[PDB]
A paper describes a structure:
The anti-apoptotic (pro-survival) proteins of the BCL-2 family include BCL-2, BCL-XL, MCL-1, BCL-w and BFL-1/A1. These proteins bind to and sequester the apoptosis effectors, as well as the apoptosis sensitizers, BIM, BID, PUMA, NOXA, BAD, BMF, HRK and BIK5,6. An elongated hydrophobic groove is thus formed along the surface of BCL-2 and BCL-XL proteins, spanning approximately 20 Å to serve as the binding site for the amphipathic α-helical BH3 domains of their pro-apoptotic partners. Herein we present cyclic peptides (CPs) with nanomolar-level binding affinities to BCL-2 or BCL-XL, and further reveal the structural and functional mechanisms of how these CPs target two proteins in a fashion that is remarkably different from traditional small-molecule inhibitors.
Since the overall structures and surface grooves of BCL-2 and BCL-XL proteins are highly similar we wanted to know whether cp1 can also bind to BCL-XL and whether it exhibits a preference between two proteins. To understand the beneath structural basis for this selectivity of cp1, we co-crystalized and determined the complex structures of cp1 bound to BCL-2 and BCL-XL proteins with high resolutions at 2.1 Å and 2.0 Å, respectively. In both structures, the electron densities for cp1 were well defined. It is not very surprising that like the small-molecule inhibitors and BH3-mimetic peptides, cp1 also binds to the hydrophobic surfaces (formed by α2, α4, α5, α8 helices) of BCL-2 or BCL-XL where the BH3-only proteins usually bind. Interestingly, the conformation of cp1 is almost identical in these two different complexes. In addition, the overall conformations of BCL-2 and BCL-XL bound by cp1 are also very similar, as indicated by the RMSD of only 0.26 Å for all their Cα atoms. Taking a closer look, we analyzed in detail the key amino-acid residues within 5 Å around cp1 in two complex structures to seek for differences, and found that most of these residues are conserved in BCL-2 and BCL-XL, except for two pairs of residues (i.e. D111, M115 in BCL-2 and corresponding A104, L108 in BCL-XL). However, in BCL-XL, the corresponding residue is A104, which has a shorter side chain and can’t directly interact with cp1-G6. However, in the BCL-XL-cp1 complex, there is some unfilled space between cp1-G6 and A104 of BCL-XL, potentially causing a weaker interaction at this position. However, upon cp1 binding, the overall conformation of α3 and α4 helices of BCL-2/BCL-XL remains roughly the same as in the crystal structure of ligand-free BCL-XL, still exhibiting a flat interaction surface similar to the unbound state. The respective SASAs in the structures of BCL-2-BAX, BCL-2-venetoclax, BCL-2-cp1 are 979 Å2, 1007 Å2, 768 Å2, while in those of BCL-XL-BID, BCL-XL-ABT-737, BCL-XL-cp1 are 1135 Å2, 1061 Å2, 828 Å2, implying relatively smaller SASA values upon cp1 binding for both BCL-2 and BCL-XL.
Numbering used by the authors:
A (entry chain A): 57 to 196
B (entry chain B): 1 to 11
The structure:
Amino acid sequence: SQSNRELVVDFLSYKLSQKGYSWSQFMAAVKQALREAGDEFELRYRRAFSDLTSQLHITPGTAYQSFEQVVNELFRDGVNWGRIVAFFSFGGALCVESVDKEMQVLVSRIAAWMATYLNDHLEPWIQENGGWDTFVELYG
Amino acid sequence: CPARYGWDYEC
């Protein structure tokens, strides 16, 4: 059970932190840099971000192809870290729209679409461009 | 990449 290991890591991280120690997982710093980069993006690029987010509205009927086509425009002539942050913020905005319209069910699906798009399209660029460690150093 | 968004300028 992946599940059981996760519960154990959560408890031990809590207990160590409660004693004034710090036991961070390898993806801890990546997560934090991404939250901060996404916040800064949405605050810096309100106009461009709105234009991005207005290009797609997710309904129970939407397929991945529709999401992929809009994200493909974002990366059509290649990848940079700024565009990767835009892709996260864009997913975020689609999830918020979904929940504003009481379609909470769509959040899971958007998460799977984002994970697929990362795996197929962005992870190979990231592994040739210094890994998520380079992102943390650039944005964290 | 060719700069098309304001965030491409920081790269």
